[PDB]
Amino acid sequence: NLSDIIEKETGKQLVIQESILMLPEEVEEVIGNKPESDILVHTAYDESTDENVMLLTSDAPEYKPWALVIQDSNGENKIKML
């Protein structure tokens, strides 16, 4: 599932609280690299680290991983393309 994909890359088992669909250029402006398709921003919140962990995949129903974005308290995004 997408959760174990997150646990795999972080070592922490996170619960997806929401999945927000966004358009490629909407994502480009944030990520810096323009995805080719609509991105589903699956977000879970790590209370432990106070970080917003977001697994970005393609739209349903394939959900091919595209990037893992980690945001810290000071509002800094840490992109990690897959």
Binding site: E18, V30, T43, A60
Partner: protein, 223 residues
């Protein structure tokens, strides 16, 4: 149609007999045997039971329901108690906290307090199968919600539409900006929150436009 507000029903009834809708209901009913589907039957049209169609003053558009147990209950962004507020909602609360003076984080994420005041929290797709986001798209829901938006656009006046994110902004492309007030910015999701949502002050502005229109402002803290 059961679990559907009568004043909304008296105006949207024409959609229930169209084939796209009959097929949609068939498909939904079908999945609810082999997939866990959110929200439960009595909460698919919760937005229709919260207030009269003629008392709608603000419209906030969402996407599909929360695909996890105990969350989705028929209102966009809202999660029923005791489910803690999801990332996006916490950012909306964060914005309201500096936008509206007497606002205080209600601890919970249940937005029924807003719904009762005339704030329509409408999702584009009204159901999802547990754990699969955007699973029930392209099944007819978007066309039905389009009709809802369309009716409000033509038969109401001076409503304030709050469109956050490109998806929502597209669904509201046809809204008459000369008849209604539209406010749009980035989505409250942590990914785009710093792209414009934080600092947008949409809640104070919404109340300004309302008062100017001669309607009672929304008491955002009433949650």
């Amino acid at each position: 149609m059961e679990f559907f507000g009568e004043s909304w029903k008296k105006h949207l009834s024409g959609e229930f007999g169209k084939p796209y809708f009959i097929k949609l209901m068939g498909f939904v009913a079908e999945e609810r045997k082999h997939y866990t589907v959110y929200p439960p039957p009595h909460q698919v049209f919760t937005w229709t039971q919260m207030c009269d169609i003629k008392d709608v003053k603000v419209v906030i558009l969402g996407q599909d329901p929360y695909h996890g147990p105990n969350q989705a209950h028929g209102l966009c962004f809202s999660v029923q108690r005791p489910v803690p507020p999801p990332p996006s909602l916490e950012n909306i609360y964060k914005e309201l906290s500096t936008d509206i003076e007497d606002f205080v984080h209600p601890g919970h994420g249940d937005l029924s307090g807003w719904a009762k005041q005339g704030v329509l929290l409408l999702n584009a797709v009204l159901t999802v199968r547990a754990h699969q986001a955007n699973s029930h798209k392209e099944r007819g829901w978007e066309q039905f919600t389009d009709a809802v938006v369309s009716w409000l656009n033509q038969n109401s006046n001076g409503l304030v539409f709050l469109l956050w994110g490109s998806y929502a902004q597209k669904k509201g492309s046809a809204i008459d900006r000369k008849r209604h007030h539209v406010l749009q910015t980035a989505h409250p999701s942590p990914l785009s929150v710093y792209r414009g949502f934080f600092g947008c002050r949409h809640f104070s502005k919404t109340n300004e436009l309302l008062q100017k229109s001669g309607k009672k402002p929304i008491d955002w803290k009433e949650l």
